[PDB]
Amino acid sequence: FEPPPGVKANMLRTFSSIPVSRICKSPNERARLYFLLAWFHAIIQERLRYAPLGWSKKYEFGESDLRSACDTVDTWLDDTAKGRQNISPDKIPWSALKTLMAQSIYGGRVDNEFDQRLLNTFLERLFTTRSFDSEFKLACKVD
């Protein structure tokens, strides 16, 4: 059995794995955050297949990292939004998540420094308040 080699397949697998109740909680900005983290995990995973270029060595960016990242986002968003149905995009702890996914999760297995630089680059491109604009680009010049 092989996972289908696709960004779409990985996103679908991620959203199927994550329970429906968890991703819909009081903060309605949570769903955007969950989608962004899922897209980031999928882009990393599918970069693994191109090991000489996508990284420097095949890391085990397994599903456990995704569960840990989901728990981190859940708990920190619960911290920042104390039972509020909405939270402003600027109030999101963007730096906290950026540094956490840069050092603890998805970064621990990262051994080479330049892989860490890549992870920082992806995280700073994706995780920011600018994401909550309708004109955001998850990629540039796909074709």
Binding site: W55, S56, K57, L118, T121, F122
Partner: protein, 272 residues
């Protein structure tokens, strides 16, 4: 059996293609003072030792194929592991790409020994002064980070400053149009992945690999000034598998170019 004969043919061919012998470097107190000479003599000793090892092992194999003597235990392992095509342990003392097969290993080793013959002949012709202007290739040298550190030590000793207070600058130029400055060392064979550099300026492109005619390594004292946002740091790897890091170069990208986009596309420098 026939694999006796085919292995005999392969061993004969390898002994033909591998160069005969490697000359050692003559020791001298002034040469011992120079760090480049010490690095190069260490390299020559290692290369001559391993060349003697492989030459003797191939002579052993070819004589055994003719039956004049019997497979020992280590010989049994060596013949079996030549037939199976996987690289022997006793031959690999320097870092190698994981999947490299014996045949292109021998081709690479022939290349390395030829370059070592070149540098030994150049050293014998003159001295460490002529040793300074040699255009070595990082992939060819067994320990190239030793070479870059030796260049650092050479410039520090020649011009009398601390090693910590020194930094490296890159001047990617054509081999013909290059200047041999006292701080400049010629490095060849460097290749970029996913970028093209013109006049020390980088541009993203879809070309898979761009060859540098000659990379110029110059050591300049630490300027203590913050790097411009247009300058990017490129990792340098020995092999395409990029499992080992040698050193880091700093490159200035072109206008309109996003250093984040250099990072995402995995732009890198490869020795081989």
């Amino acid at each position: 059996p026939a694999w006796m004969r085919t292995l005999h043919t392969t061993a004969s061919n390898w002994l033909h293609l591998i160069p005969q012998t490697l000359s050692h470097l003559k020791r001298t107190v002034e040469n011992i003072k120079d760090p480049l000479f010490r690095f190069f003599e260490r390299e020559v000793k290692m290369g001559a030792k391993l060349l003697q090892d492989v030459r003797q092992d191939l002579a052993d194999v070819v004589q055994v194929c003719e039956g004049k003597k019997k497979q020992t235990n280590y010989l049994r392992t060596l013949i079996n592991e030549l037939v199976k095509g996987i690289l022997p342990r006793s031959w690999s003392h320097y870092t190698v790409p994981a999947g490299m097969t014996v045949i292109q290993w021998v081709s690479d080793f022939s290349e390395r020994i030829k370059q070592l013959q070149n540098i030994s002949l150049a050293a014998a012709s003159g001295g460490a002064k002529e040793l300074k202007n040699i255009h070595v290739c990082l992939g060819g040298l067994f320990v190239p980070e030793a070479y870059i550190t030796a260049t650092r030590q050479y410039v520090a000793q020649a011009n009398s400053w601390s090693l910590e207070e020194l930094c490296l600058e890159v001047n990617v130029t054509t081999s013909q149009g290059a200047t041999l400055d006292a701080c400049s060392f010629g490095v060849t064979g460097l290749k970029l992945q996913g970028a093209t550099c013109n006049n020390n300026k980088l541009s993203l492109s879809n070309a898979i690999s761009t060859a540098l005619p000659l990379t110029q390594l110059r050591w300049v004292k630490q300027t203590n000034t913050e790097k411009k946002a247009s300058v990017v740091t490129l990792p340098v790897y020995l092999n395409f598998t990029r499992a080992d890091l040698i050193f880091t170069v700093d490159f200035e990208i072109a206008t309109k170019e996003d250093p984040r986009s250099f990072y995402e596309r995995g732009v890198a420098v490869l020795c081989t």
